[PDB]
Each structure stands twice: as structure tokens, then as C-alpha cells.
């Protein structure tokens, strides 16, 4: 049913120094944030979303992660696409920690290419994941297939993976959520051309330390 990233069930920080202190916010921030639905077509090529960049400037999490210079949280990711029984295809939904966009053409990528926002950007070369690293071996990461004749939803629960127990939520993005159609979408003439893909994010154990302004 659910994929559990590295078998952890994320928790709070144990007994760290410089915190006696950090606020543990309630379900006002731990609700279900539903992003936009991306239309997956025949010539579509994939998408990626940076975390926690997709929940900056959005709701209570935007007002906390912009006015705090420490941050630690784990997420619950729920990707679901709504297709009929006459469409076909497959999606690869993986979670890549420290997902670095490379830059192409023998030339560094822009700000909106690596930090796309809520509207996550699209791949240019999904075969090499836009990082010179092949999709053929991209099943090392916590993944789940969305095959349109078997299932529609994929649930991945990601803990906090970092070498430092507290960083800033604006500069550093911990992981990325790729959704790449490995097998393309085919349909007979008359069906719906675009199939939406909706994503729901619920933060689990968010912490914030040190308040501004």
C-alpha cells in the first residue's frame, strides 16, 4: 500500500544542543496541502518538485519557514492520477534526496529551473534525469509504480535526511519528487486527451527555531 522511505517513521530531534525551545506547530500547519493537477499527455516528459520549496509562501507553512532560520520536518506524499479503463501507461514516482539539476550543453541552470516553486518544472532529458544519471537505475530511491491497469495512487512517507539536524528552509532543499512517464500514454480516438495528476502533501513532525521580525 504505502512505501516507507528507508524504514524510519520520522520523529522529533533527540536532545540536541542550542535548544534549551523550538516550536512544534499543531494541525494548523499539518493539514493536507493539495497542489495543482498537471496534465499528462502523449508527448509529456516528466515533472519534478523541490521540497520544502513547494510549500514556501503557501499558507501557515509559508509564514513559518520564511520567518525561521532553523527547520526540520518530514513529509507524506500522495500522488494520484485519474484515468479510465481505456487509457494505458506507467509513471515512476521516486524521491531523490539532494537532487541537483546539472545544466546542459558542454552553462549553469537558472533559479527557476532548480527552484521551480509550486508549479514544478518539466524535464528536458528524462533518460538521464537532467543530471547525467540514468533512469534505468533510479529504483534505488523509495519508489512506487503507478500502472494504469493496476492502481492509481502512490504513497511515500519521507523522513528528514540531512547531515545537519537543522538547516534553513529557503536556501537548502532536502529532496525532490520526480514523476516520469516511462511508458507513454496511448488512447483510442474519442477519449480524454489529458489525464490529471494531483499531489497531496501533509507535513508530519515540523519544527521551527528562532523567530524574525
Amino acid at each position: 500500500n504505502i512505501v516507507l522511505a528507508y524504514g524510519e517513521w520520522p520523529e522529533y530531534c533527540p536532545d540536541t544542543d542550542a535548544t534549551a525551545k523550538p516550536t512544534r506547530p499543531d494541525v494548523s500547519v499539518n493539514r493536507f496541502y493539495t497542489l495543482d493537477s498537471k496534465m499528462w499527455q502523449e508527448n509529456s516528459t516528466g515533472w519534478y518538485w523541490k521540497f520544502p520549496d513547494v510549500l514556501n509562501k503557501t499558507g501557515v507553512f509559508g509564514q513559518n519557514a520564511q520567518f525561521h532560520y532553523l527547520y526540520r520536518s518530514g513529509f507524506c506524499l500522495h500522488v494520484q492520477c485519474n484515468a479510465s479503463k481505456f487509457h494505458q501507461g506507467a509513471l515512476l514516482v521516486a524521491v531523490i534526496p539532494e537532487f541537483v539539476i546539472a545544466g546542459r550543453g558542454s552553462p549553469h541552470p537558472g533559479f527557476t529551473t532548480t527552484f521551480p516553486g509550486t508549479t514544478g518544472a518539466t524535464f528536458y532529458d528524462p533518460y538521464v534525469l537532467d543530471s547525467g544519471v540514468p533512469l534505468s537505475q533510479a529504483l534505488i530511491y523509495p519508489h512506487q509504480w503507478i500502472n494504469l491497469r493496476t492502481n492509481n495512487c502512490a504513497t511515500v512517507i519521507v523522513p528528514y535526511i540531512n547531515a545537519v539536524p537543522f538547516d534553513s528552509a529557503i536556501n537548502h532543499s532536502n529532496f525532490g519528487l520526480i514523476v516520469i512517464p516511462v511508458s507513454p500514454l496511448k488512447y483510442s480516438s474519442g477519449a480524454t486527451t489529458a489525464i490529471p495528476i494531483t499531489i497531496t502533501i501533509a507535513p508530519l513532525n515540523s519544527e521551527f527555531g528562532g523567530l524574525r521580525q
Binding site: 493539495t34 493537477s37 485519474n82 484515468a83 479510465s84 479503463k85 494531483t198
Partner: protein, 48 residues
Amino acid sequence: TLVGQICRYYTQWSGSLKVTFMFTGSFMATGKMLVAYSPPGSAQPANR
């Protein structure tokens, strides 16, 4: 509705309500909807 016609009598009223939707499409169709309620101080939302 029935709740709104027996209170064209009865000058004051106060209580909780519920609104039930149901969908009348084909069995093969698939989609989603967002059903949002705003508090009575605010206007309707301009974006999703």
C-alpha cells in the same frame, strides 16, 4: 428547500447545517472536485 421555507416564519434562527452533493454522471467517468466553505466574515475565494 424545506429548511428555508419554514423559516419565513420564526423571525430568529441559529444552528448548524449541512450541504450534501451527489454526482449524476456515467459509471466510467472519473474526476475530482474541491468543496470549500468560507467563514461568514470573508468573501468568496478568487483562486483555488
